[PDB]
Design a protein around this ligand. Sequence first.
Ligand SMILES: CC#CC#CC#C[N+](C)(C)C
Ligand SMILES: CCCCCC[N+](C)(C)CO
Ligand SMILES: CCCCCC[N+](C)(C)CO
Ligand SMILES: CCCCCC[N+](C)(C)CO
Ligand SMILES: [Cl-]
Ligand SMILES: [Cl-]
Ligand SMILES: [Cl-]
Ligand SMILES: [Cl-]
Ligand SMILES: [Cl-]
Ligand SMILES: [Cl-]
Ligand SMILES: [Cl-]
Ligand SMILES: [Cl-]
Ligand SMILES: [Cl-]
Lengths: 65, 65, 65
Amino acid sequence: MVRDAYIAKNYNCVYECFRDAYCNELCTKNGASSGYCQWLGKYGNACWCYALPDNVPIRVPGKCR
Amino acid sequence: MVRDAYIAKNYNCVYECFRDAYCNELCTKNGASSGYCQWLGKYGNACWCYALPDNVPIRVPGKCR
Amino acid sequence: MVRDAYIAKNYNCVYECFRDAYCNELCTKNGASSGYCQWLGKYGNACWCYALPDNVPIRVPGKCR
Ligand SMILES: CC#CC#CC#C[N+](C)(C)C
Ligand SMILES: CCCCCC[N+](C)(C)CO
Ligand SMILES: CCCCCC[N+](C)(C)CO
Ligand SMILES: CCCCCC[N+](C)(C)CO
Ligand SMILES: [Cl-]
Ligand SMILES: [Cl-]
Ligand SMILES: [Cl-]
Ligand SMILES: [Cl-]
Ligand SMILES: [Cl-]
Ligand SMILES: [Cl-]
Ligand SMILES: [Cl-]
Ligand SMILES: [Cl-]
Ligand SMILES: [Cl-]
């Protein structure tokens, strides 16, 4: 299954960003259809991916550790 | 079927917004993959949903009533 | 197959834009689920389409000619 989400890294942490292309490269390398750099969002300036496969971790409620 | 669209409420009216998370919560609660708050768009500052199921009303050409 | 991409015109050139609705109309007329006007991106201010069918050309690495 796929989902639109903030791609995460160890452990439960978003990827920050400035440029859309940075996030699109990151997200698509990880199987998403595309992604972009969301500014001033829930997790600050962070990468949002569309249709990211569920073998890739995502940000969920809770702490980044 | 699903479509990308402005989610609507009675009758043929968009949801205004400030924050992306507001729209993402609204859109996903209604079955969309995600959504965001479009600023300065066709209907002002309004929620846009990706892959919103067709059992949820959307904004179509015409008046909000 | 579909892909998220910059819709292109002859030859390997993006469509520039100001308004999201301009790009959404262009992209959806060409079979995409939606599109928007990306500002200050890889190709300047240009139209990005979601789920654009592969019978529509897209921007790929290289020169616009
Ligand atoms: C300023 C600004 C801005 C923006 C944006 C966006 C988007 N998509 C990727 C959700 C369509
Ligand atoms: C007003 C200028 C907008 C450029 C910033 C674009 N983002 C990187 C925030 C795309 O979501
Ligand atoms: C230039 C700062 C951008 C933050 C606004 C982001 N929106 C809420 C308009 C996202 O589309
Ligand atoms: C800060 C105001 C944002 C309006 C510009 C929106 N775009 C046309 C860049 C949408 O991506
Ligand atoms: Cl985080
Ligand atoms: Cl943004
Ligand atoms: Cl927020
Ligand atoms: Cl309205
Ligand atoms: Cl916007
Ligand atoms: Cl408009
Ligand atoms: Cl170009
Ligand atoms: Cl943008
Ligand atoms: Cl760039």
